Amino acid sequence: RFLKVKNWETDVVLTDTLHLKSTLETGCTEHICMGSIMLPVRTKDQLFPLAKEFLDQYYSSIKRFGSKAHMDRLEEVNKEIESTSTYQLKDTELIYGAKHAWRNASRCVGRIQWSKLQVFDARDCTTAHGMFNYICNHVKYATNKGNLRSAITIFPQRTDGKHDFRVWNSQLIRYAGYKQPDGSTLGDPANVQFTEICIQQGWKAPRGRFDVLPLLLQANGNDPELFQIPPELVLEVPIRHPKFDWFKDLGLKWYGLPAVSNMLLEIGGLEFSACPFSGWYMGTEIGVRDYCDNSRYNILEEVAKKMDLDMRKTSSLWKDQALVEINIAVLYSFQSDKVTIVDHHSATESFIKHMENEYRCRGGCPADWVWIVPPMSGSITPVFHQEMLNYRLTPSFEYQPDPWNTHVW
Amino acid sequence: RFLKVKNWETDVVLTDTLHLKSTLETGCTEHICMGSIMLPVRTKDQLFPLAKEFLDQYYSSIKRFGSKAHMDRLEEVNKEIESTSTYQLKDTELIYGAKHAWRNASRCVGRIQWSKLQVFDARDCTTAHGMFNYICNHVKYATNKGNLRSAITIFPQRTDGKHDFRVWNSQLIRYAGYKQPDGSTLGDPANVQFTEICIQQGWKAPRGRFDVLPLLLQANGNDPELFQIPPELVLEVPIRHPKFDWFKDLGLKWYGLPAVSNMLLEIGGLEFSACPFSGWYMGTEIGVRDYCDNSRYNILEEVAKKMDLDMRKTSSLWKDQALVEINIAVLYSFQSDKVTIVDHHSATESFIKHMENEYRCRGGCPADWVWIVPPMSGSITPVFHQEMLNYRLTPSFEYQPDPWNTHVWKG
Ligand code: HEM
Ligand code: HEM
Ligand SMILES: Cc1cc(N)nc(C[C@H]2CNC[C@H]2NCCNCc2ccc(Cl)cc2)c1
Ligand SMILES: Cc1cc(N)nc(C[C@H]2CNC[C@H]2NCCNCc2ccc(Cl)cc2)c1
Ligand SMILES: C[C@H](O)[C@H](O)[C@H]1CNc2nc(N)[nH]c(=O)c2N1
Ligand SMILES: C[C@H](O)[C@H](O)[C@H]1CNc2nc(N)[nH]c(=O)c2N1
Ligand SMILES: [Zn+2]
């Protein structure tokens, strides 16, 4: 009932009760833990309980739980749902809802920033060009000439499921992937397929190693349209090492804006299938995963050569040595060009502080250890020694099927 | 039911049916995952079914399920239970049992070696001195002058719970930790409390930075007794770096034999409270955890200074740079002194093949991702990208409470 989590490096013990308010399933059972598995229309009967849950916590958050205002709103939404088989959120509810889905994202280490989120209400949007306009404005606002600011743009909610707004890209800004004859892959292997769905739709791929993909926007359920983000709005960073000059010769660069566009935001039962959100990078996401994952730019071997490491034996830890350098470069480059970025040491220390605040202000903090611990130097970061409880709270961000696997053209 | 796990690096998908034989609980529910939580006498009634399940597993393994030998063994065991409230395992069953507890240890990345285990049967042991003799023999055999061999020694099982055999040390070999009045710690902070118990019991502490702790052995539920492991039997490796000549000057060394001695071995319902087992180290256990944990030796700063790294800001990744060098030094040394050791790349790569083979020949391989993934360079090892299922099968190795917290002293 009242679970406890301990930090084994500092012996601090926190008590969690927030989990009791949890409603969604985890995938785990008393017989099997699925903790490491990546991926473990509504009715009026289904919707009202959800809306009620949401409103009560919202009114509770503003110290007006069980007030005429509260009571009144419940009734208004109640009448609206029975009548309209759905409802619309008050601006304040939308903002509160979005901030909280972030607050509840158990896989996000950057949640100490949860309450500082710019919300762009794009619910009056109606077309792909309109979506394009809102997205450019979001990108420009968030980039802020390198001094990044968190934001989310929220398009119209789901209705009959046949009029869904969707951004086909996984992130607003990513590089294209091309499968050459050499069997090899040009650019980012992760995007090969999407890259082709663009071509298949018209895009004139420049076939480069770092080609900024075009946005593929879908509005009201119609077919998706392509748009090239003003190059001037996409801040990029040339990757150079602060000691190895030959580094710049690797020809590496990465974009400054991390911005997830394929998730679904759920607030009080309502579904928002197009809600791109952005913050700023933690160094390892690029240096460790984008650059060194074997299924991504997989650059270790090459960086290894350039360093003249004894790649003969794994026990010389050449892969590890090179990993560190590649990551030192990233932070170095972003910092030099003055684009906001955080290292895994600072981000994890921040998250620990956030957990403590959350435990003593909200009764806990859902967190997914498997995702929170950085992909390098795990145990020298504090989160490694921190026990965490993972459970699902709403409002939330959820994954959803790629549109190209559901679109009735 | 069937469950699938996918490797996001290779797209290889596996199907698990073995989890269907999972009995114990995990700590998780449909509402909460306790996957990162460190730690989430029997009745004839409950014992009967446990022996049966075990015996069925054992006879199936030797291709004699349902045989007369199998049926006689079941009758013999059940008769013994109703008769004495317990039962004794045949040598063969003990060996099979021990090998399987290792095979089922979901937090162990070295399981590819499971079927290769020397089992020493010490169930005829009656005293602390007897325990000491058995342990010295295990240490010498397992050490094998640096060519490490996996081994386990099994002392008498629990009876009424008032006569337990227990090895008070958490590991047969570990360094003493001492709390100074100024608040600093000399030696290994992890063993301060145990080191105090040793001193209280009569140990004469040399008070150094790497003093091998004495063994504190409890036989038949009696008060524990102290014993010093013959020095010539304790293999140690001085740590030095292949290119950094000042590394040897840090004065670091570590023992070669990792041997857990505080866990409980459960086989067919029987409980073996004293069952020390040892293998060989994976580099990071020493280089990352014992050396760099803030609560252990914590040598990152001193090493970073020497390398003259920019320690003014964490974004220089000075901690990460020093960590790599320290781990290179550990591997280099061990390999130079010809003491068995495996690096985390090699070990995780082997575990993945072991895991795949297990899914194919056994229908599964319970594994705890939180523990399998190395404490450094996580994503550049194949296990990071491997989905895993964690569940509990018996036989098994379990945690038990520290003895100094439950023991009834006699005097
Ligand atoms: C301000 C800087 C931020 C930092 C440094 C940060 C950092 C991170 C990191 C390291 C991850 C893991 C990414 C991965 O492994 O794919 C992550 C995941 C995530 N973040 Fe944050 N984050 C930030 C802002 C945001 C914002 C503004 C939101 C949304 C409003 C958010 C929502 C999420 C979600 C839902 C996930 C998990 C998504 C998934 O499962 O793929 N984050 N974040
Ligand atoms: C052959 C060399 C072996 C290697 C390289 C290996 C490696 C490891 C490592 C890296 C861990 C995690 C240690 C930690 O973080 O505390 C571990 C845990 C474990 N290993 Fe192995 N192991 C080996 C042999 C064995 C043997 C022979 C047994 C038993 C017969 C065994 C039983 C276990 C158990 C029970 C755990 C988890 C203990 C706990 O939860 O504290 N291992 N092993
Ligand atoms: C707002 C924000 C801020 C920061 N710093 N980081 C992010 C994360 C985002 C940039 N780096 C990795 C991307 N996430 C990929 C999720 N893959 C899960 C996944 C989902 C589905 C499949 Cl099939 C595979 C994998 C978002
Ligand atoms: C047979 C074998 C072979 C290898 N390679 N490694 C080991 C593991 C052993 C040497 N390095 C760390 C030690 N394990 C301590 C685990 N403590 C967890 C823990 C358990 C309980 C609490 Cl309260 C805290 C922490 C055993
Ligand atoms: C199989 C395993 O769950 C998978 O590789 C996870 C591990 N932890 C992760 N953690 C983060 N932050 N991001 C990821 O993509 C992953 N991948
Ligand atoms: C809180 C968290 O579960 C704890 O720090 C775990 C994480 N993973 C680990 N993994 C291994 N191999 N050994 C450990 O001691 C730990 N500690
Ligand atoms: Zn779980």
Curated annotation (Swiss-Prot), chain A:
UniProt KW rRNA processing keyword: no
Effect of residue 281 to F: No decrease in nitric-oxide synthase activity
UniProt PTM: Ubiquitinated; mediated by STUB1/CHIP in the presence of Hsp70 and Hsp40 (in vitro).
Entry keyword set: Calmodulin-binding, Cell membrane, Cell projection, FAD, Flavoprotein, FMN, Heme, Iron, Membrane, Metal-binding, NADP, Oxidoreductase, Phosphoprotein, Synapse, Ubl conjugation
Compartments in which it is found: Cell membrane, Sarcolemma; Cell projection, Dendritic spine
Amino-acid positions noted as binding heme b in the UniProt annotation, renumbered to this chain: 108, 399
GO molecular function term, any single one: RNA polymerase II-specific DNA-binding transcription factor binding
One GO CC term on file: cytosol
GO biological process, one term: response to hormone
Residues reported to bind L-arginine: 171, 280-281, 285
Presence of keyword RNA-binding: no
Tissues expressed in: Isoform N-NOS-1 is expressed in brain and colorectum. Found in the Auerbach's plexus of the enteric nervous system. Isoform PNNOS is expressed in the penis, urethra, prostate, and skeletal muscle, and coexists with the cerebellar nnos in the pelvic plexus, bladder and liver, and is detectable in the cerebellum.
Annotated binding of (6R)-L-erythro-5,6,7,8-tetrahydrobiopterin, by residue: 36, 370-371, 384
Family listed: Belongs to the NOS family.
Free-text comment about domains: The PDZ domain participates in protein-protein interaction, and is responsible for targeting nNos to synaptic membranes. Mediates interaction with VAC14.
Primary role: Produces nitric oxide (NO) which is a messenger molecule with diverse functions throughout the body. In the brain and peripheral nervous system, NO displays many properties of a neurotransmitter. Inhibitory transmitter for non-adrenergic and non-cholinergic nerves in the colorectum. Probably has nitrosylase activity and mediates cysteine S-nitrosylation of cytoplasmic target proteins such SRR. Inhibitory transmitter for non-adrenergic and non-cholinergic nerves in the colorectum.
Assembly, per entry: Homodimer. Interacts with DLG4 (via N-terminal tandem pair of PDZ domains); the interaction possibly being prevented by the association between NOS1 and CAPON. Forms a ternary complex with CAPON and RASD1. Forms a ternary complex with CAPON and SYN1. Interacts with ZDHHC23. Interacts with NOSIP; which may impair its synaptic location. Interacts with HTR4. Interacts with SLC6A4. Interacts with VAC14.
Protein name: Nitric oxide synthase 1
Originating organism: Rattus norvegicus (Rat)
Gene (UniProt): Nos1
Swiss-Prot record, chain B:
Gene Ontology molecular function: ATPase binding; cadmium ion binding; calcium-dependent protein binding; calmodulin binding; enzyme binding; flavin adenine dinucleotide binding; FMN binding; heme binding
Expressing tissues: Isoform N-NOS-1 is expressed in brain and colorectum. Found in the Auerbach's plexus of the enteric nervous system. Isoform PNNOS is expressed in the penis, urethra, prostate, and skeletal muscle, and coexists with the cerebellar nnos in the pelvic plexus, bladder and liver, and is detectable in the cerebellum.
GO biological process, one term: response to hypoxia
Changes after translation: Ubiquitinated; mediated by STUB1/CHIP in the presence of Hsp70 and Hsp40 (in vitro).
GO CC annotation: azurophil granule; calyx of Held; caveola; cell periphery; cytoplasm; cytoskeleton; cytosol; dendrite
Chain residues that bind (6R)-L-erythro-5,6,7,8-tetrahydrobiopterin: 36, 370-371, 384
Consequence recorded when altering residue 281 to S: 30% decrease of nitric-oxide synthase activity
UniProt keyword annotations, A-Z: Calmodulin-binding, Cell membrane, Cell projection, FAD, Flavoprotein, FMN, Heme, Iron, Membrane, Metal-binding, NADP, Oxidoreductase, Phosphoprotein, Synapse, Ubl conjugation
Ligand binding (heme b): 108, 399
Positions contributing to L-arginine binding: 171, 280-281, 285
Subunit annotation: Homodimer. Interacts with DLG4 (via N-terminal tandem pair of PDZ domains); the interaction possibly being prevented by the association between NOS1 and CAPON. Forms a ternary complex with CAPON and RASD1. Forms a ternary complex with CAPON and SYN1. Interacts with ZDHHC23. Interacts with NOSIP; which may impair its synaptic location. Interacts with HTR4. Interacts with SLC6A4. Interacts with VAC14.
Domain comment, as recorded: The PDZ domain participates in protein-protein interaction, and is responsible for targeting nNos to synaptic membranes. Mediates interaction with VAC14.
Described purpose of this protein according to its UniProt entry: Produces nitric oxide (NO) which is a messenger molecule with diverse functions throughout the body. In the brain and peripheral nervous system, NO displays many properties of a neurotransmitter. Inhibitory transmitter for non-adrenergic and non-cholinergic nerves in the colorectum. Probably has nitrosylase activity and mediates cysteine S-nitrosylation of cytoplasmic target proteins such SRR. Inhibitory transmitter for non-adrenergic and non-cholinergic nerves in the colorectum.
Protein name: Nitric oxide synthase 1
Organism, as annotated: Rattus norvegicus (Rat)
Gene that this polypeptide is encoded by: Nos1
Residues of the full protein shown: 299 to 718 of 1429
